[PDB]
C-alpha cells in the first residue's frame, strides 16, 4: 500500500509468545506477527514452532511490500528467538544481520519475585 | 447439549419449529433446509427421535454460544463466611463488615460465624452482640436468613443480600 524493499525486523521474544515486528530502516513498523496471529492461543503461542510460523508470516507480509533488505534484531530471551531467526534465514529475504538487542538492566529496578528469585 | 444442524438431518420429515416456536408442519428435510438457508438460521434437530423430527430453525452455533454465555453468567452467587471471635478488635470488626458489604454488593452470601472456645459464660451473649451489630450496620446490603445461632464452639449467622 506504501512499500519500501529495505528495513528491519524486531523479534521480541517472551516465553509466553514470540512476536516479530517488521519495520523500515527508520523505525516505522509496517508488518507484525504474533502467536495469536497463527491461531495458537495459550501455551503453544510461545513455543518454537509457533514463533517460526509467526516469523514466516511476517516475512510474507513484508514481501507484499517488496521488502528484501531486512536487518534482524533479537530483543529479549524467549524460546522462539532462535527458531524465528532460522525461519527468517530460510524465508527468501535479504537478511542483513542477526543483531542481539537484549533489554538487560544495568542493575535497574527490582524485578518481579518470579523472574527474580535470582538474587 | 447438541443437535443436528440443517443438513446433519436425514431424519425424513421434520417438526418445523422456528426459533420463534411456530409450526410450519411436517415439511421434507430438504424443504426445511431450504427455508432455513433463506431465513439464515439453521434447522436444528432438538428431537430427531420424536413425533416429527423436532426441527428448531435457529442458528445452531449461535444458540450454543448463547447457552454458553448464560452458563458463564450463572457462575458469577456464592457463600462467604466471616468468622469473628468472642473477643473483638474493633478495626478488625470494621474490616470484616466492609468485606461482608462488598460480598453482598457482588451478589454473594455472608455466613457470619464467631469462634467460641468453651468459656460459654457471656460467650453466646458476646456473639449475639457482635453479629447483631454487624447486621444493623449493613441491613441495606443483606438481611439475616439465619440469626446468631449457637454452634457450640461457633455462633453462626447468615446475612443474605436484600435484592437479587
Amino acid at each position: 500500500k506504501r512499500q519500501v524493499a529495505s528495513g528491519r525486523a524486531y523479534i521480541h521474544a517472551s516465553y509466553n509468545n514470540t512476536i516479530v515486528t517488521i519495520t523500515d530502516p527508520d523505525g516505522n513498523p509496517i508488518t507484525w506477527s504474533s502467536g495469536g496471529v497463527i491461531g495458537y492461543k495459550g501455551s503453544r503461542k510461545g513455543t518454537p514452532y509457533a514463533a517460526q510460523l509467526a516469523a514466516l508470516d511476517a516475512a510474507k507480509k513484508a514481501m507484499a511490500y517488496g521488502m528484501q533488505s531486512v536487518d534482524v534484531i533479537v530483543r529479549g530471551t524467549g524460546a522462539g528467538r532462535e527458531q524465528a531467526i532460522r525461519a527468517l534465514q530460510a524465508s527468501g529475504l535479504q537478511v542483513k544481520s542477526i543483531v542481539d538487542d537484549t533489554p538487560v538492566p544495568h542493575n535497574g529496578c527490582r524485578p518481579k519475585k518470579k523472574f527474580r528469585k535470582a538474587s | 447439549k447438541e443437535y443436528l444442524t440443517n443438513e446433519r438431518i436425514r431424519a425424513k420429515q421434520v417438526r418445523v419449529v422456528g426459533p420463534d416456536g411456530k409450526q410450519l408442519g411436517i415439511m421434507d428435510t430438504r424443504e426445511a433446509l431450504r427455508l432455513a438457508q433463506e431465513m439464515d438460521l439453521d434447522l436444528v434437530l432438538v428431537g430427531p427421535n420424536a413425533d416429527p423430527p423436532v426441527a428448531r430453525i435457529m442458528d445452531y452455533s449461535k444458540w450454543r454460544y448463547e447457552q454458553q454465555m448464560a452458563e458463564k453468567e450463572a457462575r458469577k452467587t456464592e457463600v462467604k463466611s466471616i468468622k469473628f471471635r468472642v473477643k473483638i478488635d474493633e478495626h478488625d470488626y470494621q474490616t470484616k463488615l466492609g468485606h461482608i458489604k462488598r460480598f453482598l454488593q457482588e451478589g454473594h452470601k455472608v455466613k457470619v460465624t464467631i469462634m467460641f472456645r468453651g468459656r460459654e459464660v457471656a460467650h453466646p451473649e458476646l456473639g449475639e452482640r457482635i453479629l447483631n451489630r454487624v447486621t444493623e450496620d449493613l441491613k441495606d446490603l443483606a438481611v439475616v436468613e439465619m440469626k446468631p445461632e449457637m454452634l457450640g464452639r461457633d455462633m453462626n449467622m447468615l446475612l443474605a443480600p436484600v435484592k437479587v
Binding site: 544481520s97 543483531v99 542481539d100 | -
Partner: protein
C-alpha cells in the same frame, strides 16, 4: 577451557590510567560494550581493577561504549 590470546600480551607497554587513549582500551572490552574479565585480560588483579575503573570513566565521558548489541550471533 580458554587458550587463544592475552589482551595484556597482544598489547605493549602503556598507561592503563590513560582513558582518553581510547583506541587501546577498546581491546579490553568485548564485541559487546562489556569489560573483559581477569581470565580473558590476564592483568594483575590490582591492574585489572584499575583498568576497569578507567573504562568506566571513559564510558561516563562518552569515549567508550557503555553497552552493545551482539552482532550476527
Amino acid at each position: 577451557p580458554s587458550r587463544k590470546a592475552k589482551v595484556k600480551a597482544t598489547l605493549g607497554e602503556f598507561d592503563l590510567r590513560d582513558y582518553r587513549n581510547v583506541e587501546v582500551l577498546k581491546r579490553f572490552l568485548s564485541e559487546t560494550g562489556k569489560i573483559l574479565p581477569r581470565r580473558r585480560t590476564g592483568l594483575s588483579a590490582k591492574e585489572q581493577r584499575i583498568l576497569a575503573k578507567t573504562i568506566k570513566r571513559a564510558r561516563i565521558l562518552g569515549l567508550l561504549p557503555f553497552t552493545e548489541k551482539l552482532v550476527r550471533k
